[PDB]
Amino acid sequence: DKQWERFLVPYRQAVEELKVKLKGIRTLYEYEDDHSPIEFVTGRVKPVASILEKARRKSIPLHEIETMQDIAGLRIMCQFVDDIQIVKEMLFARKDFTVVDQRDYIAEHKESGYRSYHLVVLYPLQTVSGEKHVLVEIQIRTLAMNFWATIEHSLNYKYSGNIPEKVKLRLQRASEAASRLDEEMSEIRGEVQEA
Amino acid sequence: DKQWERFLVPYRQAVEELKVKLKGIRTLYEYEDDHSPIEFVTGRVKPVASILEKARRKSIPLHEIETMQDIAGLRIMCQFVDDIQIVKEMLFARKDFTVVDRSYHLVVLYPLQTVSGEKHVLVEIQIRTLAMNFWATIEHSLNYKYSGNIPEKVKLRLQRASEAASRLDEEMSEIRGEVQEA
Amino acid sequence: DKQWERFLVPYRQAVEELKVKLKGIRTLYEYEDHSPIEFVTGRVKPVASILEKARRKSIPLHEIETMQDIAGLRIMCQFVDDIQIVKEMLFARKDFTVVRSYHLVVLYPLQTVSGEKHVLVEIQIRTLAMNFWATIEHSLNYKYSGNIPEKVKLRLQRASEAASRLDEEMSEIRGEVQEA
Amino acid sequence: DKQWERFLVPYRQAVEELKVKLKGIRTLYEYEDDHSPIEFVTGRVKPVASILEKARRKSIPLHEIETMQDIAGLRIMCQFVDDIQIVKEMLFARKDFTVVDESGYRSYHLVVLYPLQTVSGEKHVLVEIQIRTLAMNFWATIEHSLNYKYSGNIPEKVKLRLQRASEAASRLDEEMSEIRGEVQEA
Ligand SMILES: Nc1ncnc2c1ncn2[C@@H]1O[C@H](COP(=O)(O)CP(=O)(O)OP(=O)(O)O)[C@@H](O)[C@H]1O
Ligand SMILES: Nc1ncnc2c1ncn2[C@@H]1O[C@H](COP(=O)(O)CP(=O)(O)OP(=O)(O)O)[C@@H](O)[C@H]1O
Ligand SMILES: Nc1ncnc2c1ncn2[C@@H]1O[C@H](COP(=O)(O)CP(=O)(O)OP(=O)(O)O)[C@@H](O)[C@H]1O
Ligand SMILES: Nc1ncnc2c1ncn2[C@@H]1O[C@H](COP(=O)(O)CP(=O)(O)OP(=O)(O)O)[C@@H](O)[C@H]1O
Ligand SMILES: [Mg+2]
Ligand SMILES: [Mg+2]
Ligand SMILES: [Mg+2]
Ligand SMILES: [Mg+2]
């Protein structure tokens, strides 16, 4: 419980770095006056309780926690669905890490009407001890989907996994609303490029 | 071109100080596991081009641009429509400045402590919902791309997007209400 | 003890606000002359120190709001004379009230969620040289648990003296430069 | 002019990334409850003027300023003189860049090539990394200010007090390494 804080140190650092790196993209794009594919970036280090519980369910032995793919997380947000593929292509082309193949959250991507996506990278962190490779999960969401996802996450923690029938249905409604807001935005960015 | 950067100095510092003041509000809620009415906060100093451009329209003489209310601006994003009202109530109650006579704005007179002494600078505070702000952002961009004259086909999709954002908020408020049926 | 986090909220916020305000002084100059401020730091006194200081000074938990340094800011200067200037700036500001080294305490009026709340804040002023020594004295006085062994204490005293010297030297550079 | 502003984009970004990478070092130690070789890290993009000033001085051809090694500069500050070689070596050991080609040994400097990922692919950039002791750097600062104020020619009355100050700073370093020394016998 105090060897935890020590264990995670490399995970913060990689977060702080990919954070500043990813944030450079928007800045570069701000000089073209061209539309930035990136609205903003956030990151987080998975909490101990989140990590242990996820181990539980994924039957990940405790000496193999390093296999967990989201101890270090970043989240890239965009205005437009179509921005995601752009961002994905940028991340594949980058050479300061490498994309780890994987096929997870296939239902989550789909249920969200493909407004939430993600890919895992192996990042080569320079340690005092030398070099330490760490998994980093990079989410890619629309602003709209992320709004909805945030609310779902709160209530889901508020009722500890038991969202009342009444509230679930209003939350489903909210989801479709968000999904629709994107619909109309994609049609905006669509109508524009008819230039 | 740089006597400007001298004019703008007390505005940047007003924005920076209020930025960290208002960001404190969400911080005071984080340990409650009670809901933060403020989701996040941004600020900007008005671009020197925007100032002259605006001084044109509203017929503001150069010697009175200090009466322009938004040289310094903050913007407060809220999750729920109901939050905007809670935040406005908070701004009116704060003593570290004074208020001057889905969205909202007010103007404060912020007493900026300087090296020369005390200086009151006007600051515009905006309060939006996330959804509202997303739509308003695209509207602003386009309103620049098409230089103030947006094509008709685009204008419609903008109107529909606007209405899409409002449903999202309305749905959001009913979650909020139904949850408060506890 | 989760009370601590809840308790220290207003102190972090006050330190955060003072931090941005004091760092504004250096900004104001480096556009107009020599800034009397080099850099600024701030810290919320950690829970362990609060408790140990409280024992030392024999303060009960229902008064630890009387401890002057639960919020602390530290302003660093180049020149001894600079400190005096900052001293007066601080005394001239209205967004709070006052109640080679130097420290004052302010009562900062924090706008809380439920109303106002005046918290004490300690502001230290130091030359860059004095601070560097002080850092070490603190670190060693830590690492050695408050009994620093003499073979080290005398060395610290020399560093103390070395630094004092260098400020003497720097006061003079300022003195000669001002003969213009 | 905005030829510059856009030209300086990759430099601003590279300073920001290395700034975060280097601040990890002090973090990693100050967690371990060890002593940290790095006290703090700063960084600068060379002002447009200083690139033109340094232009004429070193017989530049403005078509090749990208040969100028300190457009993007970082500076690491250490408590002790012994830390500097400790940093210098951590710096030689890293794989996210490659190291390339008065005050005594209280100040070092080196130049890295930084493999910057940009929107249109890779761009290697030279970044200068000065390592100094706190004391060293404090005198350098006043030195740099006056050398600038008096346009490269300092009044002999002031140069003297400078040399004196420089000796006071150097002695301070000597007392500090004696401290670290007697603590290294624990
Ligand atoms: N990649 C990421 N970027 C930013 N924030 C993230 C993130 N992943 C999670 N978070 C935040 O971290 C908290 C807890 O962990 P999780 O959301 O469950 C990450 P996950 O691995 O994708 O889901 P999981 O833990 O069920 O496996 C949440 O507040 C969430 O919003
Ligand atoms: N109060 C505020 N807080 C934060 N950002 C603001 C703001 N007012 C404007 N902005 C942002 O500043 C950018 C453009 O600035 P401006 O056009 O000069 C101010 P404005 O919103 O147009 O008011 P204006 O119409 O009276 O001129 C936009 O990105 C806009 O979203
Ligand atoms: N304005 C400030 N006042 C006090 N400490 C400050 C400070 N700014 C930074 N610090 C630092 O915060 C760190 C924590 O030290 P503390 O545990 O609070 C002991 P202290 O407060 O310095 O002495 P004290 O308990 O006798 O009052 C120290 O390294 C200290 O120098
Ligand atoms: N590598 C570095 N890291 C951080 N700050 C630096 C730096 N090199 C210079 N600076 C700082 O940048 C400011 C001005 O630097 P400049 O004069 O523009 C380039 P210079 O290195 O000082 O001269 P030079 O052309 O001989 O190389 C000074 O405050 C200086 O201390
Ligand atoms: Mg995950
Ligand atoms: Mg405005
Ligand atoms: Mg103290
Ligand atoms: Mg140099």
Rounded Cα gap, residues C179 and D160, in angstroms: 14
Token pair for residue D37?
């070789």
DSSP reduced 3-state for C3: helix
10 Å CB burial of residue B18 (0-12, 13-18, 19+) is buried
One DSSP character per residue, D11-70 reads: HHHHHHHHHHHHHHHHHHHHHHTS--S-SEEEEEEPPHHHHHHHHHHTT--GGGGGG-TT
D21 and D104 housed in the same domain: yes
Chains C, B in contact: 3+ Cβ pairs under 8 A? yes
Chain A environment of D28 (Cβ under 8 Å): 9, 13, 127-128
Q: Any idea what the CATH number is for the domain that residue B3 is in?
A: 3.30.460.10
- C-alpha to C-alpha distances, A188 to B7, B37, B128, C172, nearest whole angstrom: 39, 30, 22, 67
Q: Do C20 and B17 touch (CB under 8 A)?
A: yes
Same domain membership, residue D44 and residue D118? yes
The CA–CA distances, whole Å, from A134 to A1, A75, B32, D14 equal: 21, 17, 34, 22
Question: Which region holds residue C131: left if phi is over 0, alpha if psi is between -120 and 50, else beta?
Answer: alpha
Q: Chain C contacts of D174, Cβ < 8 Å?
A: 162
Cβ atoms of residues C107 and C120 within 8 Å = yes
| A105 and A129 part of one domain | yes
Q: Is C28 exposed, middle or buried (0-12, 13-18, 19+ CB in 10 A)?
A: middle
The experimental method behind these coordinates is X-ray
Could you tell me if B150 lies within 8 Å of chain A, comparing CB atoms? Answer: no
| Region for residue D121 given its phi and psi (left: phi exceeds 0; alpha: psi -120 to 50; beta: otherwise) | left
* Domains: count for chain C: 2
Q: Which residues line ligand 2 (CB under 6 A)?
A: B 42-44, 46-47, 50, 54, 70, 73-75, 124, 126, 140
Which neighbouring-strand residues pair with D109? D130
Q: Are residues B104 and B182 in the same domain?
A: no
Q: How many CB atoms lie within 10 A of CB C11?
A: 23
- Is B97:B72 a contact under the CB 8 Å cutoff? no
Domain at A195, CATH number: 1.10.287.860
Task: Supply D120's token pair.
Answer: 């249109």
Among residues D29, D19, D133, the alpha carbon closest in space to that of D83 is found at D133
Domain housing C166: 131-180
* Helical H segments across chain A, by residue range: 3-29, 48-58, 81-93, 106-111, 143-158, 165-192
Asked if B113 and B161 sit in the same domain, the reply is no
For residues D151 and D184, membership in a common domain is answered with yes
Binding site, annotated residues of D for ATP: 44-46, 50, 54-57, 70, 75
**Domain endpoint, select from B116, B132, B148:** B132
Report strand pairing: A130-142 vs A72-78. Answer: parallel
Residues B69 and B111 in one domain: yes
Which positions ≥6 away from D14 have C-beta within 8 Å? D72, D114, D116, D125, D127
Would you tell me which residues 20-49 of chain A have a C-beta closer than 8 angstroms to some C-beta of chain B? Answer: 35
Torsion over CA: A50, A56, A57, A61 (sign): positive
Question: Which residue from D12, B106, D71, C62 is spatially nearest to A31, judged by alpha carbons?
Answer: D12
Please tell me which of the candidates D17, D25, D117 has its beta carbon nearest to residue A94. Answer: D117
| C148 contacts C139 by C-beta, under 8 angstroms | no
Q: Do D9 and A21 touch (CB under 8 A)?
A: no
**Sheet with B40-45: strands ordered across:** B40-45, B72-78, B118-129, B103-113, B98-99
* Catalytic annotation, pick one of A137, A176, A183, A184: A137
Residue keyed to tokens 């940290």: D36
Which H helix or E strand runs over C112?
Answer: strand C101-112
Does the distance separating the beta carbons of A177 and B175 come in below 8 Å? no
Resolution of the model in angstroms: 2.8
The type of residue at A171 is L
Nearest-CA distance A101 → chain B (Å): 33
Whole-number Cα distances in Å, D170 to A170, B73, D36, D136: 71, 49, 21, 7
Residues B124-148 as b or e (16 or more Cβ within 10 Å = b): bbbbbbbbbbbbbebbeebeeeeee
| D107 membership: H or E segment, kind and range | strand D107-118
C53 and C20 together in one domain: yes
Is A103 in the same domain as A77? yes
Which helix (H) or strand (E) element contains residue D108? strand D107-118
B106 C-alpha vs ligand 6 centroid, how far in Å? 11
Ligand 3 binding pocket (C-beta < 6 A) is C 41-43, 45-46, 49, 53, 69, 72-74, 122, 124, 138
Return the closest-CA partner of residue D22 out of D102, D77, D82, D98: D77
Do chains D and B meet with 3 or more Cβ pairs nearer than 8 Å? no
Residues B119 and B139 both lie in one domain: no
Rounded to a whole number, what is the distance in Å from the CA of C39 to chain D's nearest CA?
A: 12
Residue B136 at interface with chain A, using a CB cutoff of 8 Å: no
Closest CA to B122 of B53, B74, B85: B74
Pairing of strands B72-78, B40-45: antiparallel
Instruction: Name the closest residue on chain A to residue D9, using Cα atoms.
Output: A28
Look up residue A161 and give its DSSP letter. Answer: T
In angstroms, the Cα distances linking D55 to A182, D51, D112 are 51, 6, 21
> Beta-carbon neighbour count of residue D58 at 10 Å?
8
Using CB atoms, which residue from A9, A17, A90 is nearest to D21?
Answer: A17
Residues B161 and B88 in one domain: no
Contact C40, C75 (CB under 8 A): yes
Distance from CA of A156 to the nearest CA of B (A): 12
- Domain limit, last residue, from B98, B116, B132: B132
HSE (CB half, 13 Å, CA atoms) of D125? 25
Q: How far is the CA of D36 from the centre of ligand 4 (A)?
A: 25
- CA distance to partner chain C, nearest, from residue B101 (Å): 21
Alpha carbon separation from C79 to A137, C100, C162, D142 (Å, rounded) = 49, 8, 15, 10
- Is A167 close to B160, i.e. CB distance below 8 A? no
Are D17 and D90 contained in the same domain? yes
3-state secondary structure of A79: coil
Task: Please report which ligand is nearest the Cα atom of A44.
Answer: 1
Which active-site residues of C does the annotation give? 122
DSSP B35: P
Dist. CA B115 → ligand 7 center (Å): 28
Cα B58 to Cα B49: distance, rounded to the nearest angstrom: 15
